[PDB]
Design a protein around this nucleic acid. Structure first.
Ligand SMILES: Nc1nc2c(ncn2[C@H]2C[C@H](O)[C@@H](COP(=O)(O)OP(=O)(O)OP(=O)(O)O)O2)c(=O)[nH]1
Ligand SMILES: [Mg+2]
Length: 868
DNA sequence: TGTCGCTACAATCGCTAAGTTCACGCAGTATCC
């Protein structure tokens, strides 16, 4: 009678169907000897409200205090007489429950007795501020059905579920293969210790041509790759894709090449040629229904792909739109709005993976557009078709097939990127840790993950969580650097998980720090037991430590090493976001006093460590909120390691959980400012042999907002300055290289790509006020003016500042590289680069350097020293 | 419709206020009527 399946996604409609949640997942059907998508509708999820009784009865209007003690019987009688009649509640089940509370609502005791009352989700929802003569507060009034279900059944991310006494649906309600109806939450249970089942992953790339007549993006091809046995707990398979299907349509007025049909037939691929976008969309929807993928992956899927698909479906009136998801509906949610919420609702039941968002979360790159990711991750070169060539493709079979194969290659690259970063396993792990839904986790962001983690933690410990909500404080202390150049051995000491460790050691929790509704609250007493937040953060820290230890294994595959590093960084960021959400104004658990206490303890710890190290007769030259840089004044590495171990042990002796570890040994350092230095990191190889690795932190050479020419010049200068050559030779080489770069720029021998400068966008180009015209924004608008895919918020834009004879400021002459290559009145402003891109960076680098100054750099670059 | 925290640096733009130059008065000498 039981029903075991692996649930992946959950969907709830607060307005359409009250008290109903649909769970989508995989179920093993023995006859087919494979998993089939199944949907389970958990109905009758009653809403629970906790009422806080008063100590004594109070008159409602007079605001008096009669003095009659208020018991649970009196509370129930009042709710049955006044409130039940007032708000038209017919049936409700009432019981007395002893629950805890420690959050930001005044006059609520830590532990007290409440009258839990439930009733159907069809009944009206009580107001959040409801009060009465016998009760002073009502909680959980705005509790969503999904949250109630997840917290009641203790479901934490994807996992196997067992359903008792399943029912059959009267009529089909989902596009899946198996359906089942659960009459109550209590009939659903969780079964642990079972491997996740392989899922279907569909990677799709589409090419569109915009109609300037209506500024509508019309789809002309969809190249899609599918793998039916993609694992969620193992390494990506090779080859990453099993089979594929291609669909290619024509425009409204253009026609196919002469012998397109014969060439397509000879190609032997699964090419299905749809005459019109309507037939193409119908075929795509039928294919999606047949495959029924569980994880649809793409690039800009949430921003461009799904939005265009749904808009064209609506325009062409493709009958069964709801097949894009897994539920059966008739009315499409209104498009637009912020975020991909419309897209997510449209694709309900399918986990949408946007490798753009995932790449932004996982790695750091100068640009996040597909070509840059392909070059950086896969180390391949991507051929880009200009939109004019896409329009002109309808003139020969060869070019049309080239366009289709380019779409196919883009889809393959998207799948390869998804597999390389290991996005799906990491999403599963983080979802299990947090306990939210996987689609939200893959949508990005840290607030929901930590919020659901703390929801699960507090709920399981008999606590009433706060109702969902419908530089504030000081931070870390940065030591004043001893700016200069150091040629001896510098020993770096860095704390491990400093803020998690502070939370653990000092027992900082909602139930331990007695706040008061900007003074740092008192530390908790050492008598109290460990709180919920220390326990959760300790679990996170232990998981990260386990991953790091697993990384230390010798002879590891470099790809597996990078995957482990990414996972460790993700866990570190998860813990740091758990800390940060305490100081998030819109968070469910906004506890600014707790964050202030944590930061104050961090500052105190750093100050104490600095004082201890200085009291040890050692030199301290830098430190950023958890770290210290020490000038050993030694040239032997063994003594450096010995002293480092001694000082690390001495510092660790004063703490119970906080530990200090030797971060690295720098043979040479260039301390310029706060958060700006370059060093030759030393990694010992053995038998007294060590390898020197360069390391730049915060310099302009490691920033995407500078031209690659300036970055190259600064890198060469830093390499020379950090070398062991005599100073005179270093200065001579710097002069020679600067003269060479000046000659190259003056003679136009530099490659054009070295002039690009990248600046990201915060809002849409339209939403930027008319604050003159910020360079990138300027170019951004041009890109939107031109006939190409628009540029939205959070998109990098590479522009080249060029001469136009305008006698205007540089910031108002920013242009795209294609603009320069096209227009005959635009030329690269050589003087601008030589004076404001190369000179500033090298001058900043060489500030503490003897023999080099701004005037000398200008002279070597061929500029006029006068102004400098 | 959501949206982790804070600290630091750097370029750009607007504002604006001190600093500067250029021009108006007085005194003297001189030339030229
Ligand atoms: N909220 C938040 N806090 C951060 C972030 N990055 C760093 N911090 C805080 C918490 C860290 O413990 C502290 C020191 O930074 P670290 O990069 O050395 O990380 P941490 O010491 O926690 O761990 P680790 O040294 O990598 O083992 O600064 C962040 O992105 N968000
Ligand atoms: Mg650290």
């Amino acid at each position: 009678q039981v029903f075991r399946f692996y649930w992946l996604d959950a969907y709830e409609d607060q307005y359409s169907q009250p008290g109903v949640v649909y769970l989508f997942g995989k179920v093993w059907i023995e006859s087919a000897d494979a998993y089939v998508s199944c949907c389970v509708s958990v109905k009758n999820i009653e809403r629970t409200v906790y009422l806080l009784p008063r100590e004594n009865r109070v008159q409602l209007s007079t605001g008096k205090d009669t003095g009659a003690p208020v018991s649970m019987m009196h509370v129930y009688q009042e709710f049955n007489e006044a409130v039940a009649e007032k708000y038209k509640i017919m049936k409700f089940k009432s019981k007395k429950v002893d629950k805890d509370y420690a959050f930001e609502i005044p006059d609520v005791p830590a532990s007290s007795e409440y009258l839990e009352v439930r009733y159907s989700a069809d009944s009206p929802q009580l107001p959040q501020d409801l009060k009465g003569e016998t009760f002073s507060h009502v909680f959980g009034t705005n509790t969503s059905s999904l949250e109630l279900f997840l917290l009641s059944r203790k479901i934490k991310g994807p996992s196997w579920l067992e359903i008792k006494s399943p029912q059959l649906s009267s009529q089909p309600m989902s596009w899946c293969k198996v359906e089942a109806v659960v009459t109550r939450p209590d009939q659903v249970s969780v079964v642990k210790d079972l491997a996740p089942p392989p899922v279907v992953v569909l990677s799709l790339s589409m090419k569109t041509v915009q109609n300037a007549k209506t500024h509508q993006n019309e789809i002309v091809a969809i190249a899609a790759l599918v793998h039916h046995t993609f694992p969620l707990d193992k390494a990506p398979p090779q080859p990453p894709f099993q089979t594929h299907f291609c669909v290619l349509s024509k425009l409204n007025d253009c026609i196919f090449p002469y012998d397109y049909n014969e060439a397509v037939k000879q190609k032997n691929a699964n090419i299905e040629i749809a005459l019109t976008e309507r037939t193409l969309l119908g075929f795509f929807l039928a294919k999606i229904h047949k495959i029924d993928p569980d994880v649809i992956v793409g690039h800009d899927i949430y921003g461009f792909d799904l939005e265009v698909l749904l808009q064209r479906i609506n325009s062409c009136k493709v009958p069964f739109w709801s097949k894009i998801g897994r539920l059966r509906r008739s009315v499409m949610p209104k498009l637009g709005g912020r975020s991909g919420f419309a897209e997510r609702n449209a694709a309900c039941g399918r986990i949408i993976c946007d490798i753009e968002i995932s790449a932004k979360e996982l790695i750091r790159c100068k640009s996040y557009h597909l070509s840059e990711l392909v070059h950086q991750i896969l180390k391949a070169e991507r051929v880009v078709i200009p939109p004019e060539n896409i329009r002109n493709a309808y003139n020969d079979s060869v070019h049309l097939l080239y366009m289709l194969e380019n779409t196919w290659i883009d889809a393959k690259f998207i799948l390869q990127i998804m597999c390389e970063l290991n996005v799906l396993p990491l999403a599963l792990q983080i979802t299990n840790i947090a306990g939210n839904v996987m689609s939200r986790t893959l949508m990005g962001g840290r607030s929901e993950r930590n919020e659901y983690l703390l929801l699960h933690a507090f709920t399981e410990n008999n606590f009433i969580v706060p109702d969902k909500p419908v530089a504030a404080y000081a931070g870390g202390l940065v030591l004043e650097p001893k700016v200069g150049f150091y040629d001896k051995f510098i020993l770096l000491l860095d704390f491990n998980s400093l803020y998690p460790s502070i939370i653990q050691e000092y027992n900082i929790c909602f139930t331990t720090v007695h706040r008061e509704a900007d003074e740092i609250p008192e530390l908790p007493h050492s008598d109290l037991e460990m709180g919920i937040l220390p326990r959760e953060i300790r679990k996170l820290v232990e998981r990260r430590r386990h991953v790091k230890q697993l990384m230390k294994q010798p002879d590891l595959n470099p790809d597996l090493y990078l995957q482990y590093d990414i996972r460790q960084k993700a866990l570190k960021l998860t813990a740091n976001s758990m800390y940060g959400c305490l100081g998030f104004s819109y968070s469910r658990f906004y506890a600014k006093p707790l964050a202030a206490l944590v930061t104050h303890q961090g500052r105190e710890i750093l100050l104490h460590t600095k004082e201890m190290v200085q009291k040890m007769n050692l030199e301290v030259i830098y430190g950023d909120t958890d770290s210290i840089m020490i000038n050993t004044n030694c040239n032997n590495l063994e003594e450096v390691f010995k002293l480092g171990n001694r000082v690390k042990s001495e510092i660790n002796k004063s703490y119970k959980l906080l530990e200090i570890d030797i971060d690295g040994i720098f043979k040479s350092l260039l301390l310029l400012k706060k958060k700006k230095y370059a060093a030759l990191t030393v990694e010992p190889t053995g038998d007294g042999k060590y390898v020197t690795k360069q390391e730049l932190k915060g310099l302009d050479i490691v920033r995407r907002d500078w031209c690659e020419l300036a970055k190259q010049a600064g890198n060469y200068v830093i390499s020379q300055i950090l070398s062991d050559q005599p100073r005179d030779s270093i200065v001579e080489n710097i002069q020679k290289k600067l003269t060479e770069i000046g000659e190259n720029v003056t003679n136009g021998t530099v490659p054009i790509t070295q002039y690009e400068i990248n600046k990201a966008l915060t809002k849409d180009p339209q939403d930027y006020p008319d604050k003159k015209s910020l360079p990138h924004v300027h170019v951004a608008l041009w890109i939107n003016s031109q006939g190409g895919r628009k540029v939205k918020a959070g998109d990098t834009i590479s522009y080249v500042i060029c001469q136009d004879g305008s006698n205007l400021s540089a910031s108002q002459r920013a242009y795209a590289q294609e603009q320069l290559q096209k227009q005959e009145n635009l030329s690269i402003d050589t003087q601008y680069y030589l004076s404001q891109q190369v000179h500033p960076v090298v001058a900043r680098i060489c500030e503490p350097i003897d023999g080099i100054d701004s005037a000398l750099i200008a002279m070597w670059l061929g500029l006029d020293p006068s102004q400098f």
